[PDB]
Amino acid sequence: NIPWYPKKISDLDKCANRVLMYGSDLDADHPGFKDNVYRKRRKYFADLAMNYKHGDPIPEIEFTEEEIKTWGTVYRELNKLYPTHACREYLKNLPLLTKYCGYREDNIPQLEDVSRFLKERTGFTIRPVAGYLSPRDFLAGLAFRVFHCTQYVRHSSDPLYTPEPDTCHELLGHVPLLAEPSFAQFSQEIGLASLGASDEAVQKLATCYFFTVEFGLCKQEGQLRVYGAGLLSSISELKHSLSGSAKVKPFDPKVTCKQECLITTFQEVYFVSESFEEAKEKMREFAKTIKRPFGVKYNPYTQSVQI
Numbered sequence: 001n002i003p004w005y006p007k008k009i010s011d012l013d014k015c016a017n018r019v020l021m022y023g024s025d026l027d028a029d030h031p032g033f034k035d036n037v038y039r040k041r042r043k044y045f046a047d048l049a050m051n052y053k054h055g056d057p058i059p060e061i062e063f064t065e066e067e068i069k070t071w072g073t074v075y076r077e078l079n080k081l082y083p084t085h086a087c088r089e090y091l092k093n094l095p096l097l098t099k100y101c102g103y104r105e106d107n108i109p110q111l112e113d114v115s116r117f118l119k120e121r122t123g124f125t126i127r128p129v130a131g132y133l134s135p136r137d138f139l140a141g142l143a144f145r146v147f148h149c150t151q152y153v154r155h156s157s158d159p160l161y162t163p164e165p166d167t168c169h170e171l172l173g174h175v176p177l178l179a180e181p182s183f184a185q186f187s188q189e190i191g192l193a194s195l196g197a198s199d200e201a202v203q204k205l206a207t208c209y210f211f212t213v214e215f216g217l218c219k220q221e222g223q224l225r226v227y228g229a230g231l232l233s234s235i236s237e238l239k240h241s242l243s244g245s246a247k248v249k250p251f252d253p254k255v256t257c258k259q260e261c262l263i264t265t266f267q268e269v270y271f272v273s274e275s276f277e278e279a280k281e282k283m284r285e286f287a288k289t290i291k292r293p294f295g296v297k298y299n300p301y302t303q304s305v306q307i
């Protein structure tokens with residue numbers, strides 16, 4: 001029996017913010033969970049996300065001097081590593097972000113400005129979210145070219161790694177590729193394939209998504225490079241992935257889809273494709289094997305999904 005799925009872009013208001021939270025589904029010995037004062041600050045961002053309705057501007061945030069300093073460290077340190085660690089497709093759009101989005105060490109990009117930039121480039125827009133979103137709902141968002149983003153900044157004591165996604169993850173891990181027409185098209189295709197598929201089928205697709213677009217590696221002129229958003233936002237996990245001591249295995253959906261997705265620690269294993277194009281291709285073909293009893297298109301003019 002076909003699970004509920006959104007049919008038009010405003011339907012993303014329905015049961016919004018079904019997110020995984022510390023003290024319910026997440027735990028880790030890390031100050032971003034354990035520092036009570038920091039959790040009280042995080043609730044300011046969460047409330048903003050919970051009251052958002054499609055059509056609203058995204059709330060502009062007054063960040064603390066501490067939060068701005070954290071963004072600065074993350075931005076600066078990651079940019080030193082990208083030239084040697086990131087795949088060329090990721091490197092390509094970095095200068096657009098600085099030139100056309102105001103990415104700077106001394107200022108955190110606002111989600112409203114980034115959404116406007118992305119809409120113009122590939123038609124992607126942003127919706128704010130209170131934490132790690134339910135995988136079904138996150139993939140459903142992509143079908144409308146909607147990327148759900150957190151707005152809080154990770155705990156300042158650990159710029160290197162954080163156990164839930166923060167705004168640095170969205171802005172540095174996802175935005176550069178989302179700015180690329182061919183990648184934005186790929187993203188929506190994966191999202192459309194997920195709509196109304198069984199819980200077991202979505203779990204398998206979402207796991208493969210996690211180990212490719214969140215934590216994926218690819219070969220490039222005989223070398224190992226990274227394209228996964230979750231690595232590209234973590235100073236320490238990014239280095240570790242290419243350190244020579246990480247466990248690395250070929251991406252094979254039928255094996256990979258069984259791996260547990262680790263939200264709050266470094267991964268136990270990373271999966272490699274023979275190239276970045278091969279990664280997208282194997283993902284598209286896997287999405288087609290879902291066994292859904294109907295097909296679906298997106299109509300960008302009505303912003304609705306046609307069966």
Ligand SMILES: N[C@@H](Cc1c[nH]c2ccccc12)C(=O)O
Nearest residue numbers: 161162163164165230233234263
């Ligand atoms: N570890 C990531 C944030 C993160 C936590 N859990 C995740 C799951 C998927 C992608 C990213 C994440 C970072 O430090 O930037």
Ligand SMILES: [Fe+3]
Nearest residue numbers: 173214229230
């Ligand atoms: Fe991500």
